[PDB]
């Protein structure tokens, strides 16, 4: 049976190799949700400007 | 019956020889189960990150 | 100053028109987050399967 | 921004497609440990046969 | 004095214009300090591995 | 200063890249001390075959 | 340093080796001392043949 | 096995040489953060100047 | 049997000769583990420079 | 029966002559077991060196 | 005196440079005294062999 | 001072080398005193043969 | 046995001769350690020139 | 039986003659052991030189 021992490893590889693909498989998501944030501020800064609730109507 | 005494020795040699094959018949297994341990870790690092169980719901 | 009264309506237009863009702007999101849900199921299944916590060690 | 909306579906696809690879990924392991079983029986049968422990030495 | 009134505006501009330069003058810093974090982890994962402080020497 | 912002990213790189050299660097050691245990056994086996300490001289 | 990792294995060798030399080395001794016990008998038998001590002289 | 002993020293070398890289690796950081300091003073000086808080309104 | 007494002396040899191979077979190891100690020092020097543990958080 | 008396002496000769063969028959054994001795010392010298039994575990 | 500021840095050098020379100036000594220990042993093995002091003269 | 370090050794050598000369310096003495022994027995065997002290003269 | 008495004198020689090699052998060591004491002084003199310990800080 | 009386004198001879051989036989020994005493002195003197035992450790 000497030589030809190429099975057994593979499993070690499927486990080890998969580490590379799964590791760089995340980094992409980070900015997706976060980047937007700024774009909604400009509409907010105009139309709205008077925080003062003021007196209550009918009282 | 002098000469021709080749039997008794085979039994000595059917046991002794078997020592060579059996001895190098176990080393293969060692790594099989082991090596894998590393691969499953990356998935577990990302999705899971907050050990903090937090407070109990409804209490 | 008969005629030449093409201002005023622009305001009506910008306000009215903005409805067309903004009312087609949203629809894109919806599916974005929702579709995913079907990819994580196939790894969760196989590696896990025994809900039975079993007895507590040391007791 | 009519058309050109081919980004959102990739996540849907990665989440989906991944299902095909992972679902055929497993089946290989099943027979890996189970097949063996039969091979160890033949040696056990010959060198062992008298279940009868017999009497205890010195008593 | 009619016409030639180009001064007063510069002040409105020196203040308004500076808004553009100062606004895109911060975004650069964000990643500088943060990105590094990851690189120092690998030396930490090897040489170190046994959290268990163990028993106290001389006691 | 538009473009030419190649400096900051290097830090991200020195930290991130070093992650490669260091990770591959440790694997060499594991086999080194371990493989030896087998060679010392045969000498030990012949000269030392009697465990029975026997009686104490002078008593 | 990819490839060129042929040292760490010599030790695995050397120790793994040596098993072969040492193991076939001992078999020589067994017969040396034992085969002799059959040559001393023929002189002992003829000159000596009367176990009977007989009576004690002077008594 | 006279000669051919060029392995052992590699460890000594990797351990020793690594000193050269790492002892030149640093140095770059030092000035990075410190320099800046002088740039923010010029704007703070002109728009601010009256330390005297003065009296409190409504008292 | 005058002359031809070349056996016996081999044993005197095999024992005596082996003294040579075994004696010059251990010296290799000495440097192996030792030499390394120096290389781990530089990383340890920079990142860690403040021994002062400081005060205890929350007290 | 004068002369021809060569039978009586042979016994005297067999008894005598045998002295020569038996006398030089021994000397060979002397160094057979004694020479070895030295060859086993070198392995003992290395792998063992700390006579100090040290403290007893668990006490 | 813009430009021509090459002094101060020499002092920065001269001290830093001296680190290289002094660092690789001690490693030479290590083996000097050590290596000798083995040589004096052979004379001491032969002439002296009987640790047993024996009885005291005149008593 | 790189290279030319051939002094520090030598001592290691005079100490080591001397082991070879001193080790084979002995051996010769062994048989010098011991071989004689036999040559004095033949005169003793003749001339003396009557251990019996016999009776004491004058008593 | 007239003449040929050249063995007994070798011992007288070996012992008498070795007197020559050993006698001139030692003279080498003397200078080795001693000559050094003069090179360490110069660095000691400049950096350290104030013996006066001075007052104790905090008292 | 006049003449031919040459026997009786041989005994006188053999006995008388043996004096010549045996008398010159001994002289060889004398120096053998005695000359050596001058070779051991030159190693004893350099390595040892301080007769003074000094104080006893721990007292
Ligand atoms: C005992 C159960 C073990 C296990 C046992 C196994 C076994 C057993 C096997 C795998 C295999 C695989 N495992 Mg697994 N695996 C485990 C855990 C995982 C998990 C998980 C999240 O739990 C996942 C998703 C993976 C992922 C994977 C894949 C890498 C692979 C299935 C085919 C594939 O996609 O390769 C896609 C691509 C590759 C495998 C890389 C090689 C592709 C080459 C051949 C393409 C041609 C190359 C071209 C000619 C040259 C140019 C290429 C470039 C330009 C350089 N494993 C579990 C815990 N795994 C199989 C495998 O390794 O493939 C044989 C396999 O036999
Ligand atoms: C938000 C977090 C989501 C997630 C979001 C993402 C996002 C976002 C992306 C991925 C991507 C991927 N995800 Mg995901 N993913 C999740 C859950 C999973 C899990 C999991 C176990 O939980 C795993 C392991 C996967 C697995 C995968 C891979 C299929 C893929 C990474 C590259 C790759 O290996 O494709 C290897 C092979 C392919 C992708 C198939 C296409 C390969 C083609 C381009 C090769 C050339 C074809 C040739 C020219 C034509 C001939 C081919 C044949 C002969 C027909 N995802 C998590 C829960 N995933 C990335 C992706 O889909 O790639 C763009 C990606 O952008
Ligand atoms: C994991 C630990 C497991 C284990 C797992 C393994 C693994 C893993 C392997 C073995 C293998 C073997 N094991 Mg196992 N084995 C276990 C228990 C046992 C026990 C025991 C008493 O406990 C024994 C003695 C055996 C016995 C054996 C042998 C059958 C075989 C080693 C080579 C050999 O001798 O095949 C001699 C002959 C054969 C294997 C039959 C095939 C021979 C063919 C190739 C010769 C040429 C054929 C010719 C071209 C065509 C004409 C032929 C005829 C004329 C028809 N195993 C333990 C419990 N065993 C190995 C094996 O099965 O070989 C691949 C192997 O890879
Ligand atoms: C703030 C402190 C941070 C840190 C901040 C920095 C900073 C700041 C810098 C580095 C730099 C480096 N860091 Mg760092 N670094 C940290 C942690 C580490 C640790 C550690 C184990 O803790 C180490 C040893 C490393 C290792 C390294 C090196 C990769 C690099 C020093 C030069 C070098 O060796 O590049 C050798 C080789 C390269 C850098 C790759 C590029 C080489 C090219 C230019 C050669 C020519 C290419 C040729 C023309 C094209 C063909 C090439 C091939 C055939 C394709 N860093 C700490 C935690 N590091 C410096 C750097 O990245 O270089 C400028 C740098 O400026
Ligand atoms: C760390 C301390 C370890 C140890 C580590 C080492 C290290 C390290 C090394 C050795 C080496 C050796 N060890 Mg070790 N070894 C240990 C334990 C043992 C013990 C013991 C009883 O404890 C012994 C005596 C051995 C015995 C041996 C020798 C086999 C070998 C020294 C040279 C030699 O004799 O090779 C004699 C012959 C051979 C090695 C076989 C190869 C000879 C070839 C090169 C000759 C030419 C072949 C020709 C061209 C082709 C035709 C040949 C045939 C016709 C087919 N080791 C101790 C416990 N050992 C060295 C070694 O193995 O050499 C590389 C080595 O590197
Ligand atoms: C037992 C565990 C030990 C250890 C044992 C090992 C072992 C074992 C090895 C290393 C190796 C390495 N170790 Mg280490 N090492 C330890 C501690 C450290 C620490 C640490 C911070 O603790 C670090 C990060 C280092 C860093 C390093 C690297 C220098 C090297 C991995 C490849 C490399 O980067 O070479 C980058 C470049 C070089 C090694 C210099 C030589 C490059 C040449 C070959 C390129 C071609 C030259 C060209 C043809 C000529 C022109 C060149 C110039 C123009 C003059 N070690 C740990 C504590 N280390 C390996 C090594 O050094 O490779 C042999 C190695 O064998
Ligand atoms: C009574 C039991 C005794 C004992 C009895 C014997 C007996 C009996 C024999 C051995 C033999 C051997 N014993 Mg032993 N031996 C004992 C104790 C030991 C111990 C031990 C650590 O206690 C060990 C490991 C050894 C080691 C060895 C080996 C040296 C040798 C087996 C072959 C070999 O390896 O030679 C490898 C190499 C050589 C033997 C050197 C000669 C090789 C030549 C022939 C190769 C060709 C030379 C070429 C043509 C010319 C160029 C060469 C160079 C370039 C100059 N013995 C036990 C305690 N030993 C056998 C032996 O000595 O060989 C005949 C043998 O017959
Ligand atoms: C610090 C004090 C150390 C010490 C330090 C030193 C130092 C230092 C030196 C010596 C040297 C010597 N020491 Mg010392 N030595 C110590 C302990 C000992 C002890 C002891 C019993 O404790 C003894 C007696 C020895 C013995 C010796 C001698 C081997 C040698 C003096 C010349 C000589 O005899 O070489 C006789 C022969 C040789 C040295 C072998 C080489 C001869 C070659 C050059 C002749 C020509 C070769 C020819 C051209 C080629 C063919 C040759 C063959 C046919 C193959 N040392 C003490 C404890 N020793 C000296 C030495 O080793 O010489 C350099 C030396 O420098
Ligand atoms: C009884 C125990 C006695 C003792 C008895 C013996 C006996 C017996 C013998 C020795 C012999 C030796 N003893 Mg001693 N010896 C004792 C004490 C000592 C001590 C000691 C520290 O106590 C030491 C280390 C020595 C040292 C020595 C060596 C000089 C020599 C072993 C070979 C050798 O090295 O010669 C190396 C070199 C020489 C001997 C000089 C002659 C070399 C010539 C033959 C080389 C060729 C010359 C060339 C053709 C002409 C050109 C030469 C020049 C250019 C002029 N003895 C003990 C106390 N010793 C042996 C001896 O004297 O050699 C026969 C020997 O037989």
Author numbering:
A (entry chain F), B (entry chain D), C (entry chain K), D (entry chain I), E (entry chain E), F (entry chain A), ...: 1 to 59
Reproduce text from the manuscript describing this model:
Detailed structural information is available for representatives of many light-harvesting antenna systems, but not for the proteinaceous baseplate of chlorosomes. This structure has three essential functions: (i) ensuring the structural integrity of the chlorosome organelle, (ii) connecting the chlorosomes to the photosynthetic reaction centre in the cell membrane and (iii) transferring excitation energy from the protein-free BChl c/d/e antennae towards the reaction centre. Previous studies have shown that roughly 1,000–2,000 of CsmA protein subunits, each binding one BChl a pigment molecule, constitute the baseplate. The baseplate is oriented towards the cytoplasmic membrane and in the Cba. tepidum attaches to the so-called Fenna-Matthews-Olson (FMO) protein complex, which is the last antenna before the energy reaches the reaction centre.
